[PDB]
Amino acid sequence: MKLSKDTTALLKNFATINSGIMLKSGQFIMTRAVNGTTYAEANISDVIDFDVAIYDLNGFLGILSLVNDDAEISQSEDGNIKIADARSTIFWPAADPSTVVAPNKPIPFPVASAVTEIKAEDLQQLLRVSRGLQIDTIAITVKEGKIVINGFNKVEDSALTRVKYSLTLGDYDGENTFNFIINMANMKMQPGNYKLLLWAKGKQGAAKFEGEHANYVVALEADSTHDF
Amino acid sequence: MKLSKDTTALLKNFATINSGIMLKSGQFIMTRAVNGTTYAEANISDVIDFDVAIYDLNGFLGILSLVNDDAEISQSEDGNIKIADARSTIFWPAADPSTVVAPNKPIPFPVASAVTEIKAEDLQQLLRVSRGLQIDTIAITVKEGKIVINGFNKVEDSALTRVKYSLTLGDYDGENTFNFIINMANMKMQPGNYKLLLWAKGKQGAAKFEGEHANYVVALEADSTHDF
Amino acid sequence: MKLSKDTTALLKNFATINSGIMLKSGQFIMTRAVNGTTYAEANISDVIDFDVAIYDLNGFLGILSLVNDDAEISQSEDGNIKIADARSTIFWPAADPSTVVAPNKPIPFPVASAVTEIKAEDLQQLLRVSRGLQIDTIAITVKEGKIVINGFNKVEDSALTRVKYSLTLGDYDGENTFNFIINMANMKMQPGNYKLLLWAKGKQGAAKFEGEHANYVVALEADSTHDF
């Protein structure tokens, strides 16, 4: 198998969600944070031709940048990974799968309670601002008939009453009410545009970021409220 | 009000002098070190439309560098700062004036004892060499008919007797003799060319670096000598 | 004396071998690591017109990068170093040879047992991979009529049995058997192409990397083997 630049760029991102990964034969990759707050999946143009668990994904990816593009990666004789360059060979350890937390088989996302979208420059601003504003939690709600994302510094407003940052995502044509709360540390989507699919039922809730390359599903905090 | 890239760059330089600042409506900014050793002022092209004190100038400038150019900065509903964009909004705390040391009035430099200049490439060399040679104090004096700047490491040489770096500005046309001493920690001018105005009356003295947008006034140290 | 950019670049690389150096009148420089494991030398195109020991080479070279290349480096009135250009003078300390471990004399590298080469690209990858794979020791040997370098992780594999990296240098037109072991920490040659000269007698052994700018000599580890 071979890994194009796009595929390694995706893997580098999944590497920020979970340092390790479980690759399975086919053109689909997926991962989740050790604590299950964030999950991500993607169909890739490259094809994986064997099942292997890589404990240090970013390390593996770095080692692939030292080889040619047409490098041929395969399963080493002893069970590891073999990267064959024009005149050189690199062997990378394959880990026992028990040392890598991986997600269960993919299940279709439910039908959305609410739908909207976020543009690359806005996701970028949201993420960049959280650092300087000490924003560690955001809430997607409705104000004056438009979906908006408010940012708070929970450590010192617990009730999320003092909005420090506010972003308008467009108009809401629904009729329901909600204030879905997300933990900023879970927003690991790679930069780019995203369709935002909000889902809630009772005390269950999740936000899906459907992008052009991958999909990210993040959990809503217990404190979330709605009338769906 | 809208602040341009040129104005925020100056405010960023002023933040190295004092971490907080007091803005007054108009097109003039000035600040002073909390210990009162260095002063700075600048005329700006943008206009400030409301009076406001900012405790953490740097943090503020980091937040402005995240919103568009059109970003309008205004007096918030609850008396703080509002940074409005077309689709986003960021709030920032406005401090009580009393909690921010600031100059009460501009420092005029009506008279000079000596006038010289320092070119941008030479000021840059001075600063860099200083870091490399632990130079923490400089001395402006006359040497064989030339105005020069000598650099020393005060801790390893209390008599300011071992010059580690020497820079010639030009020849002196005066008739006086002097040795103006400056603590490098007070050389906060941003890069550029400067007219240098030196003044000393008895146990008094100060140096003014006149730039083509901001000026700096730093006090000479007590062990300075002169025949003025 | 005036040091051109190519001499300072070489001097900067020797500094990674031994933080200090002993310069001597002539057109030749050399140095050896404090623990005596690696030796380096080179012919330079500038003339060093006087003996001087430099305790902090990197610092010195940094200083030299703040003045014009036309800078005159001379023996200070009091034994130290004086660097001077158009309008500025910098003084750098000369060290007592006692505080600097320098080589004694270029002992002629013996006839070689075997000879090969390593292209710049290969060398770079060897170093880059060694870091990513934590390869602390390499082995130069013959495999299928070819000279090859195998990298191991000696702390995690004492017997040097599991190759983690392998590079092909070229075919061995000779007919001897050898397994020359080198400690990665001694591979300090600056980047470029090199002629590899390997030599061994009994329990004696060393490798000389012959480059166009400079030459590096590194000893072989005790565990090396050969029938030369």
Task: Please report, for the domain that includes residue A163, its CATH number.
Answer: 3.70.10.10
In B, which residues are within 8 Å of A168 by CB distance? 87-88
Interface mutation target, options C64, C76, C91, chain B, most CBs of B under 10 Å: C91
- Indicate yes or no: CB of B59 within 8 angstroms of CB of A132: yes
Structure tokens at C30: 């050399």
Look up residue B19 and give its DSSP letter.
Answer: S
Q: How far is C88 from chain B (nearest CA, A)?
A: 4
Question: Any residues with CB less than 8 A from the CB of A157 and at least 6 apart, and which?
Answer: none
Q: Give strand pairing partners of A204.
A: A201
CB B41 within 8 A of CB B28: yes
Distances (CA, A) of B166 to B130, B137, C61, C77: 11, 12, 18, 15
Q: Which of B29, B93, B90, B26 is nearest to B64 (CA)?
A: B90
Q: Which of A94, A14, A93 is nearest to A53 (CA)?
A: A94
- By what method was this entry solved? X-ray
In C, which residues are within 8 Å of A67 by CB distance? 125
Beta-carbon count within 10 A of A199 CB: 20
For residue A135, the chain B residue with the least C-alpha distance is: B90
Resolution, rounded to a tenth of an Å?
Answer: 2.5
Beta-carbon count within 10 A of A226 CB: 18
CB A9 within 8 A of CB A16: no
CB A44 within 8 A of CB A7: yes
Q: Is C77 on the interface with B (CB under 8 A)?
A: no
Structure tokens at B105: 């009035």
Question: Any residues with CB less than 8 A from the CB of B78 and at least 6 apart, and which?
Answer: none
CA dihedral C222, C223, C224, C226 (to 10 degrees): 110
Question: Any residues with CB less than 8 A from the CB of C116 and at least 6 apart, and which?
Answer: C147, C169, C170, C172, C195, C196, C198
φ and ψ of C58, to 5 deg: -55, -45
What gap in Å lies between CA B10 and CA B22, rounded to an integer? 14
What gap in Å lies between CA B86 and CA C10, rounded to an integer? 55
For residue A133, the chain B residue with the least C-alpha distance is: B63
Q: Is C120 on the interface with A (CB under 8 A)?
A: no
Question: Any residues with CB less than 8 A from the CB of A82 and at least 6 apart, and which?
Answer: A73, A74, A75, A76, A89, A90, A91, A92
Question: How many structural domains comprise chain B?
Answer: 1
- Indicate yes or no: CB of A88 within 8 angstroms of CB of C165: yes
CB C47 within 8 A of CB C27: yes
Q: Give strand pairing partners of C171.
A: C146
For residue A169, the chain B residue with the least C-alpha distance is: B87
What gap in Å lies between CA B225 and CA A98, rounded to an integer? 76
Q: Which of C62, C88, C91 sits opposite B125 (nearest CB)?
A: C88
CB contact burial B134-164 (16+ within 10 A = b; e otherwise): ebbbbbbbbeeeebbbbbbbbeeeeebeebb
What gap in Å lies between CA B218 and CA C155, rounded to an integer? 58
CB C104 within 8 A of CB C182: no
Q: Which of C114, C115, C110, C102 is nearest to C41 (CA)?
A: C102
Beta-carbon count within 10 A of C19 CB: 18
In A, which residues are within 8 Å of B66 by CB distance? 125, 128-129, 132
Q: How far is A179 from chain B (nearest CA, A)?
A: 18
Look up residue B220 and give its DSSP letter.
Answer: P
- Type and span of the H or E element at A126: helix A120-132
For residue C93, the chain B residue with the least C-alpha distance is: B164
Q: Which of C132, C164, C168 sits opposite A66 (nearest CB)?
A: C132
Q: Which of C62, C87, C88 sits opposite B132 (nearest CB)?
A: C62
Q: What's chain B's Rg over C-alpha atoms?
A: 20
What gap in Å lies between CA A191 and CA A16, rounded to an integer? 13
Distances (CA, A) of B180 to A70, B123, B228, C46, C55: 66, 17, 12, 40, 33
Interface mutation target, options B57, B81, B89, B92, chain A, most CBs of A under 10 Å: B89
Q: Would you say how long chain B is, in residues?
A: 228
On the 0-12 / 13-18 / 19+ scale of CB atoms within 10 A, A68 is middle
Q: How far is B95 from chain C (nearest CA, A)?
A: 42
The one-letter amino acid code at B68 reads N
In B, which residues are within 8 Å of C62 by CB distance? 132
Q: Which of B28, B162, B165 is nearest to B103 (CA)?
A: B28
Interface mutation target, options A77, A81, A88, A92, chain C, most CBs of C under 10 Å: A88
CA–chain centroid gap for A33, Å, is: 9
CB A97 within 8 A of CB A113: no
Q: Which residue in this structure is represented by tokens 């893997």?
A: A11
What gap in Å lies between CA C149 and CA C198, rounded to an integer? 13
Q: Is B66 on the interface with A (CB under 8 A)?
A: yes
CB B7 within 8 A of CB B182: no
Structure tokens at A3: 């890994």
CB A151 within 8 A of CB A166: yes
Could you give the 3-state DSSP secondary structure of residue A98? helix
What gap in Å lies between CA A21 and CA A19, rounded to an integer? 7
Strand bridging mode C137-143 / C146-152: antiparallel
CB A88 within 8 A of CB A151: no
What gap in Å lies between CA B187 and CA B136, rounded to an integer? 10
Could you give the 3-state DSSP secondary structure of residue B204? strand
- Indicate yes or no: CB of B163 within 8 angstroms of CB of C67: no
HSE toward the beta carbon, residue C182, CA cutoff 13 A? 31
Q: Which of A66, A91, A92 sits opposite C125 (nearest CB)?
A: A66
Q: Give strand pairing partners of C80.
A: none
Q: Which residue in this structure is represented by tokens 């034994």?
A: C79
- Indicate yes or no: CB of A90 within 8 angstroms of CB of C133: yes
Structure tokens at B134: 């632990």
What gap in Å lies between CA A9 and CA C87, rounded to an integer? 51
What gap in Å lies between CA A197 and CA A110, rounded to an integer? 9
Q: Which of B65, B49, B225, B211 is nearest to B142 (CA)?
A: B225
Helices H, strands E: what count in chain B? Answer: 3, 16
Q: Which of C186, C191, C223 is nearest to C207 (CA)?
A: C186
Query: What angle (nearest 5°) sits at the alpha carbon of residue B147, between those of residues B146 and B150?
Result: 115
Question: Any residues with CB less than 8 A from the CB of C131 and at least 6 apart, and which?
Answer: none
In C, which residues are within 8 Å of B168 by CB distance? 87-88
Beta-carbon count within 10 A of C109 CB: 15
What gap in Å lies between CA A53 and CA B10, rounded to an integer? 52
Q: Is B90 on the interface with A (CB under 8 A)?
A: yes
For residue B131, the chain C residue with the least C-alpha distance is: C63
On the 0-12 / 13-18 / 19+ scale of CB atoms within 10 A, A43 is exposed
Q: Which of B122, B129, B164 sits opposite C87 (nearest CB)?
A: B122
Question: Any residues with CB less than 8 A from the CB of B96 and at least 6 apart, and which?
Answer: B53
Q: Which of B122, B165, B168 sits opposite C90 (nearest CB)?
A: B165
CB B70 within 8 A of CB B85: yes
Q: How far is A90 from chain C (nearest CA, A)?
A: 5
- Indicate yes or no: CB of A63 within 8 angstroms of CB of C166: no
Write out chain C in H/E/C secondary structure.
CCCCHHHHHHHHHHHCCCCCEEECCEEEEEEECCCCCEEEEEEEEEEECCCEEECCHHHHHHHHCCCCCCCEEEECCCCCEEEEECCEEEEECCECHHHCCCCCCCCCCCCCCEEEEECHHHHHHHHHHHHHHCCCEEEEEEECCEEEEEEECCCCCCCCCCCCEEEEEEECCCCCCEEEEEEHHHCCCCCCCEEEEEEEECCEEEEEEECCCEEEEEECCCCCEECC
Chains in touch with A (≥3 Cβ pairs < 8 A): B, C
What gap in Å lies between CA B84 and CA B66, rounded to an integer? 11
CB B31 within 8 A of CB B102: yes
Angle between helices C57-64 and B120-132 (to 10 degrees): 170
CB C31 within 8 A of CB C103: yes
- Type and span of the H or E element at A10: helix A5-17
Which of C 42-61 lie inside 8 A of B, CB atoms?
Answer: 59
Query: What angle (nearest 5°) sits at the alpha carbon of residue C201, between those of residues C199 and C207?
Result: 25
CB B85 within 8 A of CB A165: no
- Indicate yes or no: CB of C164 within 8 angstroms of CB of A88: no
CB C19 within 8 A of CB C54: no
For residue A68, the chain C residue with the least C-alpha distance is: C125
Long-range contacts of C211-217 (CB under 8 A, 24+ apart): C213/C6, C213/C10, C213/C42, C214/C10, C214/C13, C214/C40, C214/C41, C214/C42, C214/C189, C214/C190, C215/C40, C215/C41, C215/C42, C216/C38, C216/C39, C216/C40, C216/C188, C216/C189, C217/C38, C217/C39, C217/C40, C217/C109
- Indicate yes or no: CB of C167 within 8 angstroms of CB of A87: yes
Q: Is B91 on the interface with A (CB under 8 A)?
A: yes
- Type and span of the H or E element at A90: strand A88-92
CB C201 within 8 A of CB C51: no
On the 0-12 / 13-18 / 19+ scale of CB atoms within 10 A, B178 is buried
Question: Any residues with CB less than 8 A from the CB of C155 and at least 6 apart, and which?
Answer: C136
Q: Which of B59, B62, B66 sits opposite A125 (nearest CB)?
A: B66
Helices H, strands E: what count in chain A? Answer: 3, 16
What gap in Å lies between CA C43 and CA C26, rounded to an integer? 9
Question: Any residues with CB less than 8 A from the CB of A56 and at least 6 apart, and which?
Answer: A19, A20
- Indicate yes or no: CB of A129 within 8 angstroms of CB of B63: yes
CA–chain centroid gap for A165, Å, is: 23
Distances (CA, A) of A187 to A128, A133, A170, C80: 12, 16, 20, 58
For residue B87, the chain A residue with the least C-alpha distance is: A168
CB contact burial B38-56 (16+ within 10 A = b; e otherwise): bbbbbebeeebeeebbbbb
What gap in Å lies between CA C88 and CA B121, rounded to an integer? 11
The sheet carrying A26-32 orders its strands as A26-32, A38-48, A214-219, A204-210, A194-201, A114-118
Chains in touch with B (≥3 Cβ pairs < 8 A): A, C
In A, which residues are within 8 Å of C133 by CB distance? 63, 90, 92
Q: Is C165 on the interface with A (CB under 8 A)?
A: yes
What gap in Å lies between CA A180 and CA B32, rounded to an integer? 46
What gap in Å lies between CA A36 and CA A219, rounded to an integer? 8
CB C10 within 8 A of CB C48: no
Query: What angle (nearest 5°) sits at the alpha carbon of residue C221, between those of residues C33 and C211?
Result: 55
Question: Any residues with CB less than 8 A from the CB of C35 and at least 6 apart, and which?
Answer: none
Query: What angle (nearest 5°) sits at the alpha carbon of residue A63, between those of residues A59 and A67?
Result: 165
Structure tokens at B61: 């400038």
Q: Which of C87, C90, C45 is nearest to C65 (CA)?
A: C90
What gap in Å lies between CA A7 and CA A4, rounded to an integer? 5
CB B92 within 8 A of CB A162: no
What gap in Å lies between CA A85 and CA C109, rounded to an integer? 34
Structure tokens at C155: 């702390």
CB C165 within 8 A of CB A88: yes
Name the residue range of residue C139's domain: 1-228
CB A102 within 8 A of CB A22: yes
What gap in Å lies between CA A19 and CA A30, rounded to an integer? 13
